[PDB]
Design a protein around this ligand. Structure first.
Ligand SMILES: [Ca+2]
Ligand SMILES: [Ca+2]
Length: 597
């Protein structure tokens, strides 16, 4: 590497909340250099060197008086001198107070490689290891930012207001580079997707269409081809470099009174696979590096939020500091952690404001509601069960375990589990139940691209590839084009129309966004709940049975308050509520009523 091969973060901003900036400089023997600079409002606090002489950590304090501009950082020693121009940018107006995604938002999740190939010329890039192969379920298909930007109208038109792409950061792996979860350069968008600048454009183009951009970040591990691996900054930059030490995934070991230190440590230091070295986040240099990088992306790309992958696999103390740092920069930001557990207490532990038995504290405002999604999928798929909806009911009843349950993200599905339609047994009626549930719950709804046209997958064994098929119309020459509707089946069109109708309708229902929820215990796989406030009541009634059901409305009078009828938004039909509610087989009704007294 050149005398200065990497300077991270590459530039910073005047007027950040946290004044300190720790530059990680990588370059041949840069570690033998002393650093200095001269710029008003910026102070060289110190520099740290480690046994690997190719790295230097330079600690700057950027004061409030620091202005946007640039200055040389000059290095001296080892018989030489080096200069590196460093830039401080002005922050965009309202940056710090940027509104993170919230309950009024609907999130559309894509996998960039699999959504739309707007530029076939970047499918392969000289110097990236893996060659594209659209025929390989785990290969690179060529989806890119240009493709995404080209279809933002479609996304906005469906009624979504936030775009969540899986990571776009460079993944220069020999295999499975497409998924994005094994970063080889945290400051660089993968060239196959586009340039850093294209990403910022994605954000600005999304913003024009009223959509925010949520970045998917990985904090716990990197790709084995990360440039650090060829020249480890320190002997303890990654955990267990020697013998491969896989994590055994005992997630409760970090929040369990009877835990063995060994399990807890295995959870946060163990590797997922030999292809993903685990970062030692108890190393302060690593912690700072990650915190800065994520802030950098938010500020640089004008993000509305983060989705933090494999949340709990990061060191607990690090997560506390990381969420604290991020939320201090962006107090209205939303960030959603992926804590993969269908147990409410296990997920709730991580949410900001949670009084934990062991004193653990956090500033993470949101988590993925796996428990609820699992309960609902179970209720839709377990046909052999007479009252499977009970699970949803009971899981929802545990919302008190979360400090802010209504800030959790509820998803119809995602790239790590079976397609919604298939989870529903490829039954439109049940799929529609899931959909209404998603659109009416006191949660932030997230929808997985492709589910709007009933894409299918397997439902057992390992088959991640089946969950991530190319969006039809994303590639030139596609038979079926979901963007235009050509080649779509009538059922797929009905599904797409239903999502458009529902999502667009939801954007105009503050009662769904902020209203209260009252649910009734399901009986015989029928379930009724209401969203309400003083302006409106929305009653959702579903009959998860292949037979008609009648529910006496006397039961729901505390919500119905004598309402004689209401119009079902789905069918437009008027539904009578005086005496009984007649639900057709496998149906769901969404009835709108005036507010309470
Ligand atoms: Ca491409
Ligand atoms: Ca870890």
């Amino acid at each position: 590497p050149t005398a200065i091969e990497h300077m991270e973060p590459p530039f910073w901003w005047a007027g950040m909340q946290h004044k300190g900036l720790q530059l990680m400089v990588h370059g041949r023997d840069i570690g033998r250099m002393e650093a200095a600079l001269d710029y008003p409002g910026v102070r060289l606090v110190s520099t740290t060197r480690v046994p690997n002489a190719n790295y230097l950590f330079v600690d700057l304090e950027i004061g409030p008086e620091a202005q946007p501009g640039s200055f040389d950082i000059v290095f001296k020693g080892d018989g030489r001198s080096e200069r590196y121009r460093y830039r401080l940018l002005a922050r965009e107006q309202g940056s710090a107070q940027r509104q993170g995604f919230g309950p009024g938002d609907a999130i559309y999740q894509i996998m960039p490689d699999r959504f739309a190939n707007g530029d076939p010329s970047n499918d392969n890039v000289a110097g990236m290891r893996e060659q594209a192969d659209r025929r390989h379920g785990g290969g690179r298909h060529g989806g890119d930012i240009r493709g995404t930007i080209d279809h933002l109208d479609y996304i906005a038109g469906l009624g979504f207001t936030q775009l969540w792409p899986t990571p776009l950061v460079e993944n220069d792996a020999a295999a499975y580079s497409y998924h994005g979860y094994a970063a080889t350069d945290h400051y660089r968008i993968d060239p196959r997707y586009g340039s850093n600048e294209d990403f910022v454009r994605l954000s600005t183009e999304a913003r024009k269409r009223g959509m925010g951009l949520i970045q998917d970040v990985v904090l716990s591990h990197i790709g084995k081809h990360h440039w650090w691996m060829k020249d480890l900054p320190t002997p303890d930059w990654i955990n267990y470099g020697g013998k491969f030490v896989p994590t055994q995934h005992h997630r409760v070991a970090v929040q369990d009174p009877y835990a063995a230190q060994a399990d807890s440590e295995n959870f946060t230091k163990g590797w997922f696979v030999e292809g993903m070295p685990d970062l030692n986040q108890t190393n302060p240099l690593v912690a700072n590096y990650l915190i800065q990088n994520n802030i950098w992306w938010i500020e640089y790309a004008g993000l509305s939020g983060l989705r933090i992958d494999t949340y709990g696999y990061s060191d607990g103390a690090f997560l506390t500091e990381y969420t604290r740092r991020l939320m201090a920069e962006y107090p209205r930001l939303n960030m959603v952690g992926e804590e993969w557990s269908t147990r409410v207490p296990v997920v709730a532990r991580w949410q900001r404001g949670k009084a934990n038995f062991d004193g653990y504290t956090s500033h993470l405002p949101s988590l993925m509601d796996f428990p609820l999604v699992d309960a609902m999928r179970n209720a839709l798929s377990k046909t052999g069960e007479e009252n499977g909806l009970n699970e949803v009911y009971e899981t929802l009843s545990l919302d008190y375990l979360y400090p802010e349950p209504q800030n959790l993200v509820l998803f119809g599905g995602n790239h790590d589990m079976a397609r919604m339609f298939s989870a529903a047994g490829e039954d439109f009626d049940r799929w529609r139940m899931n959909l209404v549930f998603l659109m009416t719950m006191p949660r932030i709804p997230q929808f997985y691209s492709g589910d709007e046209i009933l894409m299918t997958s397997t439902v057992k064994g390992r088959d991640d590839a089946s969950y991530r098929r190319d969006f039809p119309g994303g590639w030139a020459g596609d038979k079926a084009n979901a963007f235009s509707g050509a080649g779509l089946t009538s059922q797929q069109r009905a599904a797409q129309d239903l999502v458009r109708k529902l999502a667009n309708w939801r954007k105009n229902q503050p009662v769904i966004h902020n209203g209260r929820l009252m649910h009734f215990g399901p009986e015989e796989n029928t379930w009724v709940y209401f969203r309400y406030n003083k302006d409106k009541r929305i009653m959702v009634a579903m009959n998860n049975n292949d037979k008609p059901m009648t529910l006496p409305t006397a039961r729901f009078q505390e919500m119905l308050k004598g309402a004689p009828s209401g119009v079902d938004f789905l069918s437009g039909k008027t539904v009578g509520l005086g005496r009984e509610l007649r639900l057709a087989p496998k149906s769901v009704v969404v009835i709108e009523l005036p507010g309470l007294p």
